[PDB]
Amino acid sequence: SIYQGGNKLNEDDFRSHVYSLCQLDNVGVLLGAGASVGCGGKTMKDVWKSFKQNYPELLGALIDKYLLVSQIDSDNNLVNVELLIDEATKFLSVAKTRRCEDEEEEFRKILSSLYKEVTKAALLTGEQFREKNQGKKDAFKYHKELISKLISNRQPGQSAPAIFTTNYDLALEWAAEDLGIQLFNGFSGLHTRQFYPQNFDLAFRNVNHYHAYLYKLHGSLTWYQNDSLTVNEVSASQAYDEYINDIINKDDFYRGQHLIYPGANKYSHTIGFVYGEMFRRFGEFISKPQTALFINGFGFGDYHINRIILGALLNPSFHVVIYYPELKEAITKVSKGGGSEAEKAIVTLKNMAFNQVTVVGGGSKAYFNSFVEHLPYPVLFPRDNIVDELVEAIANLS
Amino acid sequence: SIYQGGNKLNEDDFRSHVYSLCQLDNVGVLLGAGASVGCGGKTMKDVWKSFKQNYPELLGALIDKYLLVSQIDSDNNLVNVELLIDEATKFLSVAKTRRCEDEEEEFRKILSSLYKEVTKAALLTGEQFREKNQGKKDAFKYHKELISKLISNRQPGQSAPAIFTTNYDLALEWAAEDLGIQLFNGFSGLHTRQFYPQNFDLAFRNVNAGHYHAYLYKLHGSLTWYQNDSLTVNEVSASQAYDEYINDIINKDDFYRGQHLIYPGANKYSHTIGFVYGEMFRRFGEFISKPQTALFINGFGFGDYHINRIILGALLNPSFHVVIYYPELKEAITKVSKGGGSEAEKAIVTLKNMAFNQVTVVGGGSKAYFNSFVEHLPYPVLFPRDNIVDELVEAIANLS
Amino acid sequence: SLIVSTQRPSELSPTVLAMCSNWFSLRLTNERDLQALRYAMESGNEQILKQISGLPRGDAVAFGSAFNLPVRISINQARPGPKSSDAVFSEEWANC
Amino acid sequence: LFKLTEISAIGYVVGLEGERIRINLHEGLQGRLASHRKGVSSVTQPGDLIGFDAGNILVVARVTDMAFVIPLRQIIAYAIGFVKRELNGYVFISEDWRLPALGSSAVPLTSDFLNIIYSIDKEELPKAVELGVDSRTKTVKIFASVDKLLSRHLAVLGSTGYGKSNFNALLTRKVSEKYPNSRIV
Amino acid sequence: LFKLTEISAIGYVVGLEGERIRINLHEGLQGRLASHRKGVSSVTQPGDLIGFDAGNILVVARVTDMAFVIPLRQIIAYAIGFVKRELNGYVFISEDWRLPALGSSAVPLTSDFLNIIYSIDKEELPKAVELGVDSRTKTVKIFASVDKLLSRHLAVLGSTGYGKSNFNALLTRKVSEKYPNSRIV
């Protein structure tokens, strides 16, 4: 169930161990794609499954004619999707520059289908992606608790919490705008919004507990590059009216250096800059002394991130906490022989003789809605909500 | 067999004494040709046997004509090898000056054999001398432990350890480049190394608030120092030296250049080469004239006159301490008591009988070897005695 | 050998207390019961006596020859314990 | 590639006034907790134990004051002994007449040294019974040699309703199961 | 429009000299009086109770000194216990060796936490009798358990004309009312 250093722990010692880790100089969180399935998202297995069911003609070409994907993992549903999209984009650009007509129209169909499939599943509320006050709904109840508990546990004079993620949906922004918090994501301006890498060095001050940081490692639905060689950000309504509507209800793919998700168009030196900056900043954070990190919802299928995390244990003051539901299955599959790279990677660090590593397993005791409650509220935090009963009366005066 | 002014003392008292001398202001170590015999080296009387078994024809002419060596010594294996090469170079130089063509070959032919013999014993790895990461092998396991123990028991605001030696091989450099320590030895540069004697007064510091360095004084030269056409002394790397001149010395049989090499104490008549030798001795004499010094000696045979003279004079200062290892007291005490032995035995036995508390002699065969010297030294409480980094490195390498 | 258990160290022979070797002390709230312990033992440590006046239920301060330095201890619970207690009034008054 | 210590520092000595010690903290420490290879330890509250590295021994101290002087903080401490290494383990000596040097680093005390401080001799372990745990941290277990307890006399003191009878029962029951050839009345 | 606390502070900690706590006060009426959702509170003289924020516990202390150092004002205080959460409410523990860290803010105690400090152990309520009201603020009722009160002997002391007979009559009558099968002489 719960392992630290190779042996077992109980609920009370673990709950007391979590509390002391939140009072260190640096605190961070790393979230994956499984943290959004409780509010309308999907896992990569489901995306591949639905694509494989919907488009059975294009699947033969990718396997036979161009060798972009293998058979065994296609059957098992273990393909990396953003790597496939990046490779397809490279193929299309090469075909375009050397003037081959047969392949240029062949790859447009594949790319448009892949974008349709991955865009449809990231709109967490369907047609109501346009309207305002989306964070007021009950699906976003636990993101607010996460942010509140993570801010209110800092003593004055300590740094603000930092958040990393591999998603490209808008759950955290909608949740944070409803509390009254301001997040720094690297952009500034309203009528023309641009990316400045030095916005991560600023903080507010009162001249008479406001802010946090957000790092998006795979892009976002509202980032695009125009005819000018700069990257812009717009709001959800404007993006929906501009290009998101046509992706879903039409056969539209005519700009190839436009969208900045998921990890696509890395061969352009204007677009690769953003990804490089995000990853460098992530690598610098876990190299500081007196640091703690929590990981939840992330399946250890990335070689670069695994390489970074392991090399940081060489410092005596770095601690990490990991959540992995399907743990027994991995243990049996690797003791008997076999398993993929994720299973070997997680099992090899579960068995170390380190007091800096903690692994939590279970069925639904390692889910996102179980991670939030292990984190405590302070004794003087106000919890009784009595301003809404006043707002309803104010509106009832009419 | 441990003595202190003539009185035998047990082991625990000796250990408590060594523990107390390692926390003084100044600490030093002197090492000889017996300290590198656990790595692949040879002593001085193992070199004479090889020479006189391999070249029996020059031995007659080198005794019966030029009077450069006595019969008693060469019969008893008591030849001073590096004191003969200097005299040979002098002879060759004078013969070259006055233009005696018949006498030049007889010395160019024997200087080519003396180097061919002494050079081969200092490689320590044979044909692997030009490869990288030689400090990861098991022969250098105790040099690392010595260097690590010396640095770890200094307190802030104290001097750095100093190490002197008469060996001219590369054991200590290989050992120190594996721990990540930096040793100062008077040279600076990369594309041209040059000798700057004034940088023995330099030290490091940290700009944020580190103290990981030491000094190394090589008394008889090195294999990697040589004098090019210009009158400046250079240093190269082991691979480069091997590809430049060492290969031909070991293989080719008629290879002699001239006043080129700077080992072992050979071309002293030149006035730009003796400068290098003089500085090491001046600084050695300067080190042991300080109020709170403690010096450990191991591997030394006491067959030198100038070093003995310097050591004797430094004892008329009431706060200088010496510890001596000599694995042959029993075979010398009797030979001195009956009729008198050799100069080395006479020196060591005159030193043993002194009625001071400032001298300590250790004997007993294998109980006074280099390996036994290391474990008599302390070990810090907070020094990490485990293995955690290597497992993580193995896991990293295994990845992908 | 003797083992003595009293709640009034002040009502004891001054010689009997002064000739022990190990002392355990639970909460002791009275200014004249602390003086007996003070004079029974030596000087050289006063920061340790101020704790005894505020120990919780089940803690002790032990010092003697079986201890290298004085310790504050949280004692385990015996199983099975001694007899529970005396009678209780509420049960008998409600046995109609 | 060289590591002199696998533990971080807390502050450095800036003054000595006889037998009391004065320490200045660094800039980052605000949350009263410091971490290492084994876990997290508290360092700033009065009554805690810390140590200074002095050559090849460790000197152990206890905290008394803590105040202001971003402003600086300060600490006062007193020494109560030192820890030494002899063959393959450690021993604790209770002589406290040695002081560190100016600039000496101050470190937290991990849980491995804490076991050494509250320990009995290794040869007497077969002659020991268990009483409880450490009160401030509740990690270390406390043992005592029966030979040194029941050689001279023993005293148990306390008020009413605080646990004298519990201790008596716990102590007397164990001795019967260890030395059955013993007289108890 | 995000809030960390709905009751405003009075000062902050600037020292810990052993068992004492030293407090510096904010300027003006900000350092004497506070207004909140349930009324108004104040700390004004020696004898009052004050609280310190320490994360997941609340430390309880009592005032002893006040003086001038607009001039600056200071306070001394001593600790009693602390408060924490159990299931959906709170409980009071009575150990007095824990202290707050430097820079912590000090707040006055509301009547809601006073109702928690002076309560009984949540199960003796069916056998509890009401005696009066706390003297200083007169907003908290005091209860006592019959089994604990009338187990061993009890003592009522005082001069003449001050109210012994009132107390005796009150206690005896409302013990007779609760248990009609009682025997009293």
Ligand SMILES: Nc1ncnc2c1ncn2[C@@H]1O[C@H](COP(=O)(O)OP(=O)(O)OC[C@H]2O[C@H](O)[C@H](O)[C@@H]2O)[C@@H](O)[C@H]1O
């Ligand atoms: N409700 C839940 N709560 C928590 N975890 C859950 C839940 N449901 C499933 N899981 C677990 O959540 C995990 C879902 O793993 P996937 O979504 O494939 O992994 P990723 O988000 O890293 O994929 C993106 C990466 O792809 C590239 O490799 C790059 O690294 C990208 O970052 C499984 O363990 C589920 O059991």
Ligand SMILES: Nc1ncnc2c1ncn2[C@@H]1O[C@H](COP(=O)(O)OP(=O)(O)OC[C@H]2O[C@H](O)[C@H](O)[C@@H]2O)[C@@H](O)[C@H]1O
């Ligand atoms: N394993 C061992 N460990 C320690 N000592 C050893 C060991 N094996 C042998 N010995 C001892 O090591 C010693 C070897 O002594 P030598 O090599 O002849 O003397 P040097 O190194 O001073 O020769 C160079 C000097 O010659 C001129 O005098 C110049 O001054 C030079 O400095 C013997 O005592 C062995 O018993």
Ligand SMILES: Nc1ncnc2c1ncn2[C@@H]1O[C@H](COP(=O)(O)OP(=O)(O)O)[C@@H](O)[C@H]1O
């Ligand atoms: N260390 C302890 N742990 C748990 N309970 C304890 C402890 N010490 C005492 N008690 C409890 O207190 C109750 C009465 O204690 P007791 O030993 O009778 O006090 P005394 O005899 O000193 O008046 C017992 O029922 C016991 O369960």
Ligand SMILES: Nc1ncnc2c1ncn2[C@@H]1O[C@H](COP(=O)(O)OP(=O)(O)O)[C@@H](O)[C@H]1O
């Ligand atoms: N709690 C109380 N509230 C109001 N009056 C009181 C109280 N206690 C005592 N008194 C007053 O004290 C007077 C006499 O007190 P009494 O009960 O005779 O005390 P005692 O018996 O000690 O002299 C009564 O007239 C009563 O009014």
Ligand SMILES: [Mg+2]
């Ligand atoms: Mg009793």
Ligand SMILES: [Mg+2]
């Ligand atoms: Mg009356």
